[PDB]
Amino acid sequence: SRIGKQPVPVPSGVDVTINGQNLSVKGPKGTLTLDVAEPISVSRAEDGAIVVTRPDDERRSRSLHGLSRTLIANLVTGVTEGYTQKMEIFGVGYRVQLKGQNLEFALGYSHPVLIEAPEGITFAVESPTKFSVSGIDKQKVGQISAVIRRLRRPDPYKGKGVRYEGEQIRRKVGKT
Amino acid sequence: MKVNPSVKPICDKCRVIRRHGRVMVICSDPRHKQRQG
Amino acid sequence: MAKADKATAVADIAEQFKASTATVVTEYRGLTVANLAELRRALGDSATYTVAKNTLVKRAASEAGIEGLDELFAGPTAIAFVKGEAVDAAKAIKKFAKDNKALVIKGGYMDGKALSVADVEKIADL
Amino acid sequence: MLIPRKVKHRKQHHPEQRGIASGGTSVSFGDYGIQALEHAYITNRQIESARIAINRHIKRGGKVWINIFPDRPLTKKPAETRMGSGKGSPEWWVANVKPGRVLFELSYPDEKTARDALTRAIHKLPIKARIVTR
Amino acid sequence: LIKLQIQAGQANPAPPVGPALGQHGVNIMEFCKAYNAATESQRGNVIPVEITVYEDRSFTFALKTPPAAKLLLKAAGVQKGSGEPHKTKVAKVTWDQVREIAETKKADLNANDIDAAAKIIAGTARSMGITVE
Amino acid sequence: NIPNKLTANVRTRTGKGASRQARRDGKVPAVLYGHGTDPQHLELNARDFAAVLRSHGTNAILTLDIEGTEQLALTKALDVHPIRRNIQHADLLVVQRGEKVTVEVTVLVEGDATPGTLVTQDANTIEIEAEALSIPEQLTVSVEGVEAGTQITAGQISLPEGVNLISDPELLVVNVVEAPSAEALEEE
Amino acid sequence: AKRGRKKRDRKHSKANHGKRPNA
RNA sequence: GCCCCUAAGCGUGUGCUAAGUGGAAAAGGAUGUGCAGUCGCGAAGACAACCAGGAGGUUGGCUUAGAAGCAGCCACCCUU
RNA sequence: ACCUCGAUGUCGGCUCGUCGCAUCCUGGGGCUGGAGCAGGUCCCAAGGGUUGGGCUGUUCGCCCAUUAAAGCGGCACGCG
Ligand SMILES: [Mg+2]
Ligand SMILES: [Mg+2]
Ligand SMILES: [Mg+2]
Ligand SMILES: [Mg+2]
């Protein structure tokens, strides 16, 4: 509600095409599509911005308004700037490397693990223990980051594992 | 993950949400994770 | 704000005026949040700075013999008052006007004699 | 545990529980009282448990009034005997409580604390009840 | 940053300041000498050091004023305070001694004049279970 | 000491049946017997009556507009309900426009005794006599610095001008006693 | 147990007026 | 009783139901939802969000190898 | 004591199985006063397995070797 009632500032170099409930956006980073909820109506204001409107104030519409608004906001923001999640590793003997387009991690396992970069996403590395994923779909980027994080079991006694950029995990202490 | 018919917040910054079909409480302290059942 | 806040702020400013050697009023409307650091952070230690609404300064200024400042409350009011020596605070407020060119000066009060923008400058330099 | 010092009749006929409490409805001594809503017997064991819980939750101060005293006896037949014999001996004492009657009252000054104590007490009773203020 | 009430004539007390500041990485050898050379002048008044941590692990102990709570002990003559406030007394203190301790504590208390400087110690004595006469 | 206005319509049918029928729609019956006068069965709004009560109730005075006929009455009892809290039936008596009346009034303690002491209000009501409008809605008793066992009776309460106490002056209204210890609490 | 529970609960139906034989 | 079996209405006006509750059940737990009755605040800019602060006496004594604001009781204060 | 005394043969052991998980293991997950092995607690999970002997009719129980296991119950305290 408080968010859905606000407009969506569309940048200059963006082409927004509304087709009923469906919507598509084209920008420098790529092209994305989306489908808005049926009880909500999307409209392109005279200033190019996008606005979602609800005909009633029921719980369904009140919950879907801000959801769809933030969805279209992230959609239009990705094509222009894209999302990038940086991650770092901690623990002696842990290493990560970029092989072609996939990633290879060695985190103490008897064998190394491989993660194949799916479509619409890319990986990069700045240090043997510091890498970063990039993409357009925030959902896909977050899913890939969560997978790379849960790769290893969460070890609080020593923090050995994967961590996000500004991650702050709890740490216990072993007296012996 | 305590599983009892009754659940209440033991932490200080806890929210009680309603999941798919069960209630839950959320706080950083993993010892306070409770589910109704 | 709440009525409890309105009632506690007036008492706070009364305590400020009764425990401080002097107080200078300025206009702080026009600054963002990021300024408040280079603001209070380095001033609240030795000096002190407070801000409130106009409706509270009228009730707070009716305690001491500063009735002459009734007509000097035009616009928002932000009060500054030192805990020790006032010459440093006076010099700071005087140089801030020429550094920012946005803090309008109106005057102050000394020994019950209200000073204007020209009278306060005769003592700010000494 | 409370118990009558002496009774005129050793055995009774299960005093009926019905109607609405005629007397002892409004709090008189304390400031915050517990008023029941379901008619059912209350045992001296439950009364003592609630009293101990209240005394433990309220330390170094406060006072508690108990407007109910267990005086109605209730027998318990032999362990595994057959049906038909002299009525068993009284085995536990209860007090017929009707809805609307206050059972316990508190004088602890801090509201929140008195309410929490009354909650911990009612949680020890076998019937539903609520809190009332003077 | 932390301020403890460590005795003046004593040197290297482990319980109070053993792991308090030593764990932060500040040495104690030169600290003992710097404390003794400054406390040998008085030899009769406790001095609380305001431990100020630094980035380069340096240390410049702040020679603050003595503590009012402990100076109340010397004013009353007994080292162990009372057990209950406004219920028991230990001894009587003189207004001249109160003004003297206030003057010595001028550089620590938030007071402005001798009146408030002594009234703060009077309130401390009230909270501890002692009154000024 | 300002009368509170309220409307009321003469009831056309009495009995438990009519009473329940009126209560179902948010109304309350009442009687206006008065002083040796012909009683009148009236019906008032439950919400308005409850509002007036929670505002200045507990024997408050009232003004009845019975078909345009003004009357000044005073309440004698409520008897809301054993379980619930609703005005099931009220009773009113005409005040004769200034006649001296005796009625119960609620007392309240406002103060703070010594730290190691607890206060107990043994009686909440006091029999006070006064005019129709001068009837005080509440009485206040203060406590400060008193020691244990300082029994404050009804006679020690300060009453406004024109007010009188009908109950004997020996009624112990407030009793302060040393803070009961854990042993005193567990030996009850 | 369940058999008797169901036999007693099926009496609550609004088609028999809340009465049935053998409880 | 009126959708099929199963003869009769997939009858009409206003509301509730997301759980197949309808088509078993308790103590207790619970930011589910609709109505009405109250109270705090709120364009004098309400709450969340954001940002700066969050001391001196003092480590209040008692208690303690030990309470410093945060195992325990007492009161629960003055300055800025 | 509601059918059953003009008959429903009662406990163990052998053969034979069937079904539930309030799960002994195998499988997965949460919290641990989980440094690791080895443990404690909870949730889901019955596809599979759940030994051979001495005492005593025995059920049960103790003991000897092991075993990831030597599980709890219903089926007329299963099966004449
Ligand atoms: Mg036959
Ligand atoms: Mg299971
Ligand atoms: Mg299978
Ligand atoms: Mg054998």
GROMACS .gro file of N, CA and C in nm, chain A residues 115-164:
model
  150
  115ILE      N    1   3.035  -2.576  -0.962
  115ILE     CA    2   2.908  -2.507  -0.979
  115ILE      C    3   2.905  -2.448  -1.119
  116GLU      N    4   2.811  -2.496  -1.201
  116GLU     CA    5   2.797  -2.451  -1.339
  116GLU      C    6   2.712  -2.324  -1.341
  117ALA      N    7   2.769  -2.216  -1.394
  117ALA     CA    8   2.699  -2.089  -1.403
  117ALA      C    9   2.580  -2.101  -1.497
  118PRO      N   10   2.455  -2.093  -1.449
  118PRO     CA   11   2.341  -2.102  -1.541
  118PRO      C   12   2.331  -1.980  -1.632
  119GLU      N   13   2.234  -1.982  -1.723
  119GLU     CA   14   2.216  -1.870  -1.815
  119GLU      C   15   2.173  -1.745  -1.739
  120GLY      N   16   2.204  -1.629  -1.797
  120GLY     CA   17   2.166  -1.503  -1.737
  120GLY      C   18   2.243  -1.466  -1.612
  121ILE      N   19   2.358  -1.528  -1.588
  121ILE     CA   20   2.439  -1.498  -1.471
  121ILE      C   21   2.585  -1.525  -1.505
  122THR      N   22   2.675  -1.454  -1.437
  122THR     CA   23   2.818  -1.468  -1.458
  122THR      C   24   2.889  -1.464  -1.324
  123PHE      N   25   3.011  -1.517  -1.322
  123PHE     CA   26   3.095  -1.519  -1.203
  123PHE      C   27   3.226  -1.447  -1.231
  124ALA      N   28   3.289  -1.401  -1.124
  124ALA     CA   29   3.420  -1.338  -1.133
  124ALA      C   30   3.492  -1.359  -1.001
  125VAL      N   31   3.625  -1.346  -1.004
  125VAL     CA   32   3.708  -1.367  -0.886
  125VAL      C   33   3.813  -1.256  -0.880
  126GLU      N   34   3.833  -1.201  -0.760
  126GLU     CA   35   3.937  -1.103  -0.737
  126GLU      C   36   4.048  -1.154  -0.646
  127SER      N   37   4.028  -1.269  -0.582
  127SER     CA   38   4.127  -1.329  -0.494
  127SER      C   39   4.096  -1.477  -0.483
  128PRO      N   40   4.196  -1.561  -0.451
  128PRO     CA   41   4.166  -1.704  -0.431
  128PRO      C   42   4.058  -1.730  -0.328
  129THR      N   43   4.021  -1.631  -0.246
  129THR     CA   44   3.917  -1.646  -0.147
  129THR      C   45   3.812  -1.536  -0.156
  130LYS      N   46   3.802  -1.467  -0.270
  130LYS     CA   47   3.707  -1.358  -0.287
  130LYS      C   48   3.653  -1.360  -0.429
  131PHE      N   49   3.522  -1.379  -0.442
  131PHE     CA   50   3.458  -1.386  -0.572
  131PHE      C   51   3.329  -1.305  -0.569
  132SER      N   52   3.259  -1.302  -0.682
  132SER     CA   53   3.137  -1.223  -0.694
  132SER      C   54   3.055  -1.274  -0.811
  133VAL      N   55   2.925  -1.290  -0.788
  133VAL     CA   56   2.831  -1.327  -0.893
  133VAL      C   57   2.759  -1.202  -0.940
  134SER      N   58   2.722  -1.200  -1.067
  134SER     CA   59   2.653  -1.086  -1.127
  134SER      C   60   2.543  -1.137  -1.218
  135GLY      N   61   2.437  -1.057  -1.230
  135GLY     CA   62   2.327  -1.096  -1.315
  135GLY      C   63   2.225  -0.985  -1.328
  136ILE      N   64   2.111  -1.020  -1.387
  136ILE     CA   65   2.000  -0.927  -1.406
  136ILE      C   66   1.883  -0.962  -1.316
  137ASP      N   67   1.850  -1.091  -1.305
  137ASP     CA   68   1.738  -1.135  -1.222
  137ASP      C   69   1.783  -1.142  -1.076
  138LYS      N   70   1.727  -1.053  -0.993
  138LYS     CA   71   1.763  -1.053  -0.852
  138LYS      C   72   1.731  -1.187  -0.787
  139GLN      N   73   1.620  -1.250  -0.827
  139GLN     CA   74   1.584  -1.379  -0.770
  139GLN      C   75   1.689  -1.485  -0.801
  140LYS      N   76   1.732  -1.492  -0.928
  140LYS     CA   77   1.833  -1.590  -0.965
  140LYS      C   78   1.966  -1.561  -0.896
  141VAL      N   79   2.004  -1.433  -0.887
  141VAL     CA   80   2.129  -1.398  -0.820
  141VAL      C   81   2.124  -1.441  -0.674
  142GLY      N   82   2.013  -1.412  -0.606
  142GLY     CA   83   2.000  -1.452  -0.467
  142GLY      C   84   2.001  -1.602  -0.449
  143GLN      N   85   1.934  -1.675  -0.539
  143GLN     CA   86   1.934  -1.820  -0.530
  143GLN      C   87   2.074  -1.877  -0.547
  144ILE      N   88   2.149  -1.825  -0.645
  144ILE     CA   89   2.285  -1.873  -0.667
  144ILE      C   90   2.373  -1.841  -0.547
  145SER      N   91   2.357  -1.721  -0.490
  145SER     CA   92   2.435  -1.684  -0.373
  145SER      C   93   2.403  -1.773  -0.254
  146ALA      N   94   2.274  -1.804  -0.234
  146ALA     CA   95   2.235  -1.891  -0.124
  146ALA      C   96   2.289  -2.032  -0.144
  147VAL      N   97   2.289  -2.081  -0.268
  147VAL     CA   98   2.345  -2.213  -0.295
  147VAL      C   99   2.494  -2.214  -0.265
  148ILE      N  100   2.566  -2.112  -0.312
  148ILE     CA  101   2.710  -2.105  -0.288
  148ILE      C  102   2.739  -2.091  -0.139
  149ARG      N  103   2.647  -2.030  -0.064
  149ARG     CA  104   2.667  -2.015   0.080
  149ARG      C  105   2.643  -2.147   0.153
  150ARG      N  106   2.533  -2.215   0.123
  150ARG     CA  107   2.500  -2.341   0.187
  150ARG      C  108   2.583  -2.458   0.133
  151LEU      N  109   2.668  -2.434   0.033
  151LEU     CA  110   2.761  -2.537  -0.013
  151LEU      C  111   2.820  -2.616   0.104
  152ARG      N  112   2.870  -2.546   0.205
  152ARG     CA  113   2.933  -2.608   0.320
  152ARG      C  114   2.845  -2.594   0.443
  153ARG      N  115   2.864  -2.685   0.538
  153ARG     CA  116   2.789  -2.681   0.662
  153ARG      C  117   2.830  -2.559   0.743
  154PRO      N  118   2.734  -2.487   0.803
  154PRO     CA  119   2.770  -2.370   0.885
  154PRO      C  120   2.850  -2.409   1.008
  155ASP      N  121   2.977  -2.367   1.013
  155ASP     CA  122   3.066  -2.399   1.124
  155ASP      C  123   3.088  -2.274   1.208
  156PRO      N  124   3.020  -2.259   1.322
  156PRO     CA  125   3.041  -2.138   1.404
  156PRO      C  126   3.164  -2.144   1.492
  157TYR      N  127   3.214  -2.263   1.525
  157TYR     CA  128   3.330  -2.273   1.613
  157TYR      C  129   3.452  -2.206   1.552
  158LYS      N  130   3.467  -2.216   1.420
  158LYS     CA  131   3.580  -2.155   1.350
  158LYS      C  132   3.541  -2.069   1.232
  159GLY      N  133   3.413  -2.066   1.194
  159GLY     CA  134   3.371  -1.986   1.081
  159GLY      C  135   3.416  -2.036   0.946
  160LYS      N  136   3.469  -2.158   0.939
  160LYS     CA  137   3.517  -2.213   0.813
  160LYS      C  138   3.399  -2.239   0.720
  161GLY      N  139   3.397  -2.171   0.606
  161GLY     CA  140   3.290  -2.188   0.510
  161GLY      C  141   3.281  -2.067   0.418
  162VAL      N  142   3.164  -2.051   0.358
  162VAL     CA  143   3.137  -1.941   0.267
  162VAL      C  144   3.065  -1.830   0.343
  163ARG      N  145   3.086  -1.706   0.299
  163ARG     CA  146   3.025  -1.591   0.363
  163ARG      C  147   3.002  -1.482   0.259
  164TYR      N  148   2.899  -1.401   0.283
  164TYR     CA  149   2.869  -1.290   0.194
  164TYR      C  150   2.970  -1.177   0.217
   0.00000   0.00000   0.00000
